[PDB]
């Protein structure tokens, strides 16, 4: 959906796999703020939102 009612997916009780996310080259802009692009497979987040 466009930016008027932007969807919000609350992911929980999972095992994230950002390693296959930032190593697919199917993205044009991958900028991480607060955290580094890598070093995300060694962290355990409380609540993530897509």
């Amino acid at each position: 959906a466009s930016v008027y009612a932007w969807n919000r997916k609350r992911i929980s009780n999972c095992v994230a796999d950002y390693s296959v996310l930032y190593n697919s080259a199917s993205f044009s802009t991958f900028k991480c703020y607060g955290v580094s692009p890598t070093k995300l497979n060694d962290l355990c987040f409380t609540n993530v939102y897509a």
Partner: protein, 49 residues
């Protein structure tokens, strides 16, 4: 209350030590006050700042 001069020095030293310890709970403008978090969440080129 007679031994007040001897207790004041101990109290001042304890307050100085407690303040020096509590000064480690501050970020001083950073994102966290723990070096481990900064080093495990940021890359070396961006964590030195």
């Amino acid at each position: 209350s007679a031994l007040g001069k001897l207790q004041d020095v101990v109290n001042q030293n304890a307050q100085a030590l407690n303040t020096l310890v509590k000064q480690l709970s501050s970020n001083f403008g950073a994102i966290s006050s723990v070096l481990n978090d900064i080093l495990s969440r940021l890359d070396p080129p961006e964590a030195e700042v």
